[PDB]
């Protein structure tokens, strides 16, 4: 099945012009844990932001332009993206906005990290209706010596 | 000679206990390049923020408390911290606030990162009178896809 994974600040802000103003090693640790050994689909801007391929996962880039790196798979359509995943039990889509909006309709699960940060954003997570999703796990944490803001992990499944 | 190295937000606010709300890999690289192969003196809150010995550096912890860990050197006073460094050309003091207050008077140099971020905070880097310090190097950088905010590296020499 297809799942979406994202970190949302207040108002569902997911990206800004520059790097997000927070330092959340535990959030990254949760992202890794939930994506390891799975194929991940991302857009080009997100790829460019990451820098290198995500270790231990099959990296698939969805983009209309030509591929720039031989260490990943470049695809041109959603259909192409899915097919390239092969036969695995769960596909993870990691953004950005556009990619999230194109994949939401086929998604059965959301892994979200709500961060308590108020920022002006450039892109946002698509609007989802809470009456359509069931919260099956939630866990709140305050900022600490290593995390700059408080955050809450949440997993939702489509009703 | 003794040097202080710090990251300052607007109005000289520095970290107290929770991690600071920014993400500046360029600044951590600067921190690393300037402290590598040298001894570093820090307080107990900085030690928890770091979470493990800085590699390639002699880690000295100044604190009233007990040395939980064996990989670093635990001291109870400034004089003890200094002696622990032995005979080297430059000692790096890495914070926090009280630790900066204590070594400032003996400091000959300051490596500061001025970050364009408004953070609400209790602690401040000690007041330095720039007429007692000569700014000798200043280099500004804009925020980018990797750096959450604008920052400026600056080195000051005690006159
Ligand atoms: N929960 C969540 N948090 C995020 O920061 C996030 C980021 C993206 C897209 N950008 C990124 C940028 C860096 C890394 C990253 O470096 N991941 C490393 C983390 C280091 C670790 O897990 O020890 C990785 O191996 O996954 C991942 C995704 C998508 N969904 C998200 N979802
Ligand atoms: N300029 C400056 N920047 C800072 O971020 C800063 C932080 C402290 C104390 N806090 C910290 C927290 C983490 C690391 C740390 O993990 N440093 C690694 C670099 C890892 C990396 O560049 O990804 C190191 O090896 O120095 C250092 C100090 C003291 N002076 C500062 N001074
Ligand atoms: Ca529930
Ligand atoms: Cl993208
Ligand atoms: Cl401290």
UniProtKB/Swiss-Prot annotation, chains A, B:
Pathway: Cofactor biosynthesis; tetrahydrofolate biosynthesis; 5,6,7,8-tetrahydrofolate from 7,8-dihydrofolate: step 1/1. Changing residue 152 to S: Increases catalytic rate 1.5-fold. Increases catalytic rate about 7-fold. One of its GO terms (biological process) is response to xenobiotic stimulus. It comes from the Bacteria. Changing residue 42 to V: Increases catalytic rate almost 2-fold. Substrate binds at residues 5, 27, 52, 57, 113. The keyword NADP applies. It is an enzyme of class 1 (oxidoreductase). Changing residue 20 to I/V: Increases catalytic rate 2-fold. InterPro entries: DHFR (IPR012259), DHFR-like_dom_sf (IPR024072), DHFR_CS (IPR017925), DHFR_dom (IPR001796). Belongs to the dihydrofolate reductase family. The strain K12 sequence is shown. PANTHER family: DIHYDROFOLATE REDUCTASE. Key enzyme in folate metabolism. Catalyzes an essential reaction for de novo glycine and purine synthesis, and for DNA precursor synthesis. This is Dihydrofolate reductase.
């Amino acid at each position: 099945m297809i799942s979406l994974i994202a970190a949302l600040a207040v108002d569902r802000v997911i990206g800004m012009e520059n790097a997000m103003p927070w330092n959340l090693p535990a959030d990254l640790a949760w992202f890794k844990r939930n994506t390891l050994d799975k194929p991940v689909i991302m857009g080009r801007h997100t790829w460019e932001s990451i820098g290198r391929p995500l270790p231990g996962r099959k990296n698939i880039i969805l983009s209309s332009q030509p591929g720039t790196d031989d260490r990943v798979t470049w695809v041109k359509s959603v259909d192409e993206a899915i097919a390239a995943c092969g036969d695995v039990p769960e596909i993870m889509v990691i953004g950005g906005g556009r990619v999230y909006e194109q994949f939401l309709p086929k998604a059965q699960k959301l892994y979200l990290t709500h961060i308590d940060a108020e920022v002006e954003g450039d892109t946002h997570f698509p609007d989802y209706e809470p009456d359509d999703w069931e919260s099956v796990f939630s866990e709140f944490h305050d900022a600490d010596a290593q995390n700059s803001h408080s955050y809450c992990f949440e997993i939702l499944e489509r009703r």
